[PDB]
Design an enzyme around this catalytic site. Sequence first.
Site, PDB file in Angstrom:
ATOM      1  N   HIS A 142       1.107  -1.612  -0.328  1.00 16.66           N
ATOM      2  CA  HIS A 142       0.096  -0.028  -0.170  1.00 16.66           C
ATOM      3  C   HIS A 142       0.638   1.356  -0.079  1.00 16.66           C
ATOM      4  CE1 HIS A 142      -3.869   2.327   0.949  1.00 16.66           C
ATOM      5  NE2 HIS A 142      -2.892   3.046   1.696  1.00 16.66           N
ATOM      6  N   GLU A 143       1.770   1.020   0.864  1.00 15.08           N
ATOM      7  CA  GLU A 143       2.733   2.930   0.999  1.00 15.08           C
ATOM      8  C   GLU A 143       4.014   2.975  -0.229  1.00 15.08           C
ATOM      9  OE1 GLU A 143       1.710   4.331   3.377  1.00 15.08           O
ATOM     10  OE2 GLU A 143       0.768   2.684   4.638  1.00 15.08           O
ATOM     11  N   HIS A 146       1.499   4.111  -2.835  1.00 11.62           N
ATOM     12  CA  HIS A 146       1.296   5.737  -2.564  1.00 11.62           C
ATOM     13  C   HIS A 146       2.912   6.253  -3.692  1.00 11.62           C
ATOM     14  CE1 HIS A 146      -2.311   6.377  -0.383  1.00 11.62           C
ATOM     15  NE2 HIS A 146      -1.909   6.079   0.507  1.00 11.62           N
ATOM     16  N   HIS A 152      -6.016   6.137  -3.220  1.00 10.89           N
ATOM     17  CA  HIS A 152      -6.752   5.642  -2.704  1.00 10.89           C
ATOM     18  C   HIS A 152      -8.105   5.555  -3.481  1.00 10.89           C
ATOM     19  CE1 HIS A 152      -5.591   6.587   1.865  1.00 10.89           C
ATOM     20  NE2 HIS A 152      -5.146   5.771   1.647  1.00 10.89           N
TER      21      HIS A 152
END
Length: 214
Positions: A142-143, A146, A152
């Site tokens: 997830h990080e 980004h 999102h």
Amino acid sequence: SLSRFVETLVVADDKMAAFHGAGLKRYLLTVMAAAAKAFKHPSIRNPVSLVVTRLVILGPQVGPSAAQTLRSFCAWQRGLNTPEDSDPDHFDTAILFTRQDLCGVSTCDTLGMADVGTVCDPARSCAIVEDDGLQSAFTAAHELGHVFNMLHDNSKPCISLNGPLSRHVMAPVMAHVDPEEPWSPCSARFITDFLDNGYGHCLLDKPEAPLHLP
Ligand SMILES: Cn1ccnc1[C@]1(CNC(=O)c2cc3cc(Cl)ccc3o2)NC(=O)NC1=O
Ligand SMILES: [Ca+2]
Ligand SMILES: [Ca+2]
Ligand SMILES: [Ca+2]
Ligand SMILES: [Zn+2]
């Protein structure tokens, strides 16, 4: 079509060492192998090879505020890097694992933090992950999403790109991730554009000495 390789510095704090002990290096490579598997899934459309090239076991200021832990870590990691990607010690992104319960402004439900779309900027290419002991690879993915400029999946731009029909890496909160589609169409679009616009220019050289699991 170009192979992309993200030369990755993995950092574990004193809390990680205290808990995992002698098994920490193996644990971190296992977590990162799993994150790497996510980044090769065809749903991402522009797959990239997440490669651990350096592994540091501890430094930076780690505390409850995720924002200031990220800022501290991102300033600290600069010092370990070298100016040119030609150097074997150079790395493209820095990721910190900690056992610290990371928090946002109002709750501590947060599991990690990263600034968005920073992968080839050595001053900014940073992520932090709260190690939960079981799903840390998903938090790392997830990080890193980004870092690769992804939003999102409940964001406005993502509604148009995903359609109307919480099961992906870039859900706003961790839920069960679809094994056939870890990355939404919005995720693939945003990473694809990021690379198409030349923001992955530092991902083109092949690492020398990747760290491999036995
Ligand atoms: C930036 N910020 C500020 C406050 N809270 C945050 C959050 C919280 N989310 C998580 O920690 C987190 C982990 C995770 C894993 C999967 Cl598979 C899916 C969704 C996920 O969300 N941190 C972040 O990176 N985005 C955020 O919204
Ligand atoms: Ca290099
Ligand atoms: Ca937390
Ligand atoms: Ca590189
Ligand atoms: Zn997020």
